[PDB]
Design an enzyme around this catalytic site. Structure first.
Site, mmCIF file in Angstrom:
data_model
loop_
_atom_site.group_PDB
_atom_site.id
_atom_site.type_symbol
_atom_site.label_atom_id
_atom_site.label_comp_id
_atom_site.label_asym_id
_atom_site.label_seq_id
_atom_site.Cartn_x
_atom_site.Cartn_y
_atom_site.Cartn_z
ATOM 1 C CG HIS A 101 -2.026 -1.115 1.022
ATOM 2 N ND1 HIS A 101 -2.738 -1.341 -0.135
ATOM 3 C CD2 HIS A 101 -2.439 -2.054 1.906
ATOM 4 C CE1 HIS A 101 -3.547 -2.371 0.042
ATOM 5 N NE2 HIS A 101 -3.384 -2.821 1.273
ATOM 6 C CG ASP A 150 -5.037 -1.577 -4.575
ATOM 7 O OD1 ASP A 150 -4.559 -2.709 -4.792
ATOM 8 O OD2 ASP A 150 -5.197 -1.128 -3.424
#
EC number: 2.5.1.16
Lengths: 291, 293, 285, 282
Positions: free
Chosen positions: D74, D167
């Protein structure tokens, strides 16, 4: 010091494993491998022979367990001795499948046998068994044994009124050895008083095939009777076999004295077990329509 | 969540691995979902769903029951001694918190009182909620569930029961367990009436051959009649299960009346007259291990 | 017919597996085995060499993956080239461990090398590598290579002011590191694999602490290792003065006359950049 | 039952097997307990507890997040493009139903609005209830969670976002992202491991490079993803990842960073020879 000079006894760890998936791929058996003895591929299938600390040498075809040194006697004795002892004087026997040789070994224990033909579809299985599966392939060199590399369905139809006993083992694939016409060919290849036995698998994971085999054999042989035996390393542990004949009844025509006076070693089969093996639990009777 | 949820489909990522004695062989099962996982002061309980076997119940990583085949085990453990007794009215079951053996015992109309003695209360509570196929008899008016150690509980009785059945108890303790001692078997003998019968699960004569032999030997030192019988158990180690019948005179073959089974008014999925007699036929390797050759 | 005559190309199935457990035994890696090439046991450990459809030949010791044909270059190049290129003129090199020969192979690519000693404790590992791991053991035949079967911690103590470079391809005490320092020349360099700062964080920290107490210059560098636990591998460079960044001459790498599949000038400098969690574990930031 | 239950202890019977592309290698994990198992019209969700990794979230048997290391992924996916942008105010995140990337994006005070576009509504709800570590930004007033197909959703915008993060793959899609970005917008997308998923890696890079004038691959460690070597592709309409990077912005950052830092930002762009060869850069 050389490579061989530095080698010591191989010790089993927890990193090498054999996974056997059952029909459906939802359950299976796993075994630790101390070492892999042989891995080979033929035009028909893959062969793997390895050593397990508890079961000894294990033989698998396409990832399916065929034999285990610790318990193969359970399977080979039940498949072979039921029909062999029921026949009045078995001289000529045909075994289809059984590339490991176990069934042949059990058949050869009967002194009446003059010729036992082992029909195996894969020559590589015979060669691997001869070299690595000594416990079961010990009968390959017996003068009474004749090994034939052929498709059993094609081979049996060449004979008429020739054999006393026909046994269908489980090592030969066909995606042929289980059609009504194949069983009819077996019937025609047998003499008037011939007997037959075929391994018909577990009435659990392989219930579909079990029912199909019984139905097809029953459409050909007047006497068709399922018998059960323990098989400690086969799927579910509950194995079925189907005895068939042209008149000989597996219970009514059984002579316990032949077994009691037998001059060879038996690690599973005996007179009480012969009769008991024909007692089917209710769920099996329901699957076969035997109430 | 609930509004977006659909029927859960199994994949190839979740598995349950059971190791057999020796840790060289075992069974693996796919898990579509884990229904319950709990830990008591005694052991760990895991209940999950397998696509082929249905609901599976395991204790400390040892398979206890499967929905697809538990009937094979419970029917052989219970019906052999129940049908051999002349009129079984009072029955004591030690172990088997899933309730299967109790369910089979309750099928016999002669039963007036059946006690299920389980050491772990969490097993009973989990069975009520998640193992309904086997726990269906827990609330029968004739049934009584007692949370206690079987070896201590049975000693409180003398000339009280018609039938005593020893189901699964402390699988991780093996042959050294408290329910496999001569003292315990003697307490069972003493708790039984003059014509009482007994049955005990005695493991697989393959991976647990030593335990099997020990159980038979100790039971035989107490009861004048002791006989091993076998049954298929499709999800237990090796698939070859043994049970030991014992009594103070009743013979499992000479006193077997097939008519009681033929006229039985309840469902039986495994056990029948032919199977009863056949179960006592032992293969040569088993006879040799017991010294019966 | 004979066995060989009936044999065909062996095809992989879903029945044979190799399971490797990581430290803690809660996570691990599994690999399909098409066939097992060799399984042997020495007085020290068990050796297994097998074939995986994607990774090729895999070599494991006691169930721990040591090398795979597909990615061993990542590890061997980072462990060897960082110290080799940083040394002004490396002529005598000592490699402790690395029985597969990969590190030796990389060291031998440097033309300045006159003698490279591979000190492996298990003779069976050397023999198995020579016979079955030709990709990594090709340097065994080099006239400059000398294979010594001995305990590395005991062996290095026999030398003083002898080597230009010492590489630890495997032997963890401060005394051992001091022995390495004493075995190196005045301007000698050193490198040691210090595992993954994830499952093996304990060892990683301990190794760094002990090496840093001996060498004036001690710097951790990182590299990808696609088949080792976590995929994040650490190495520790050490010297008596040579700085891995300030004294790095990228031209030596740019002009290198041998093949490099991972290591290059950009990667050399980049490997010394440590993520925050690693710096915190080492007491840096 | 409630009175009898104790702390659940791990054994060696419950396991999670994750197969990598090709089905020849994979990762296995002990499962002490299964927290949630659900099925949507799109995929299956499994959340469980591992003694070493903590809470593990998987989709169709593929590991998505691990409590112990999700920060590695992340932070690299989000901070590289966020710090490279002069003043990121409007951000669009496609995928990332767990919320980790959104959490990292929100650390930047300049952000006024961050849209998280997840295709599976069940993932968002499961994350909100069971993955608190990553879904902590779901209630942020600047965050806007939308359930839709990212490829179709991005087409609603033109010259709107300062940053777009993928993502979760066509040239048409990347062009839509380019168009949705402002004249000086930046972009980042996870591009898999250049090992087991080399094919996907190469394809993503080729397609992105055909749309954006500046396309650069950067690498990061990801301790529980296949191979441990993860790639990300940065793209822009002019901003250079190295030349236009201001390390002071990172040093002065008033928020917690467990992986990303100024030296790692620059170092991540250094590609090993085998990667350069696969991208035609060598």
């Amino acid at each position: 010091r050389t490579l061989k000079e530095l080698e010591r006894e191989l010790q089993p760890r927890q990193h090498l494993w054999y996974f056997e998936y059952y029909t459906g791929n939802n359950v299976g058996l796993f075994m630790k491998m101390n070492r892999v003895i042989y891995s080979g591929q033929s035009d028909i299938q893959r062969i793997d022979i390895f050593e397990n600390p508890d079961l000894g040498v294990v033989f698998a075809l396409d990832g399916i367990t065929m034999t285990t040194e610790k318990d193969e006697f359970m399977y080979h004795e039940m498949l072979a001795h039921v029909p062999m002892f029921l026949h009045p004087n078995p001289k000529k026997v045909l075994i289809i499948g059984g590339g490991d040789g176990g069934t042949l070994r059990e058949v050869l224990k009967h002194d009446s046998v003059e010729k036992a033909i082992l029909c195996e579809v894969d020559g590589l299985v015979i060669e691997a068994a001869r070299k690595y599966l000594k416990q079961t392939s010990c009968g390959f060199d017996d003068p009474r044994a004749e090994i034939v590399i052929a498709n059993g369905a094609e081979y049996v139809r060449k004979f008429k009124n020739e054999f006393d006993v026909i046994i269908i083992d489980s090592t030969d694939p066909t995606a042929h050895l289980f059609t009504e016409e194949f069983y009819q060919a077996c019937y025609d290849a047998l003499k008037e008083d011939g007997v037959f036995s075929a391994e018909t698998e577990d009435p659990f994971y392989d219930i579909g095939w079990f029912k199909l085999a019984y139905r097809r054999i029953s459409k050909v042989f007047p006497i068709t009777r399922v018998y059960l035996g323990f098989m400690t390393t086969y799927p579910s542990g509950m194995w079925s076999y189907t005895f068939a004949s042209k008149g000989i009844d597996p219970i009514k025509d059984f002579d316990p004295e032949k077994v009691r006076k037998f001059n060879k070693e038996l690690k599973y089969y005996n007179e009480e077990v012969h009769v008991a093996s024909f007692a089917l639990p209710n769920f099996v009777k329901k699957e076969l329509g035997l109430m």
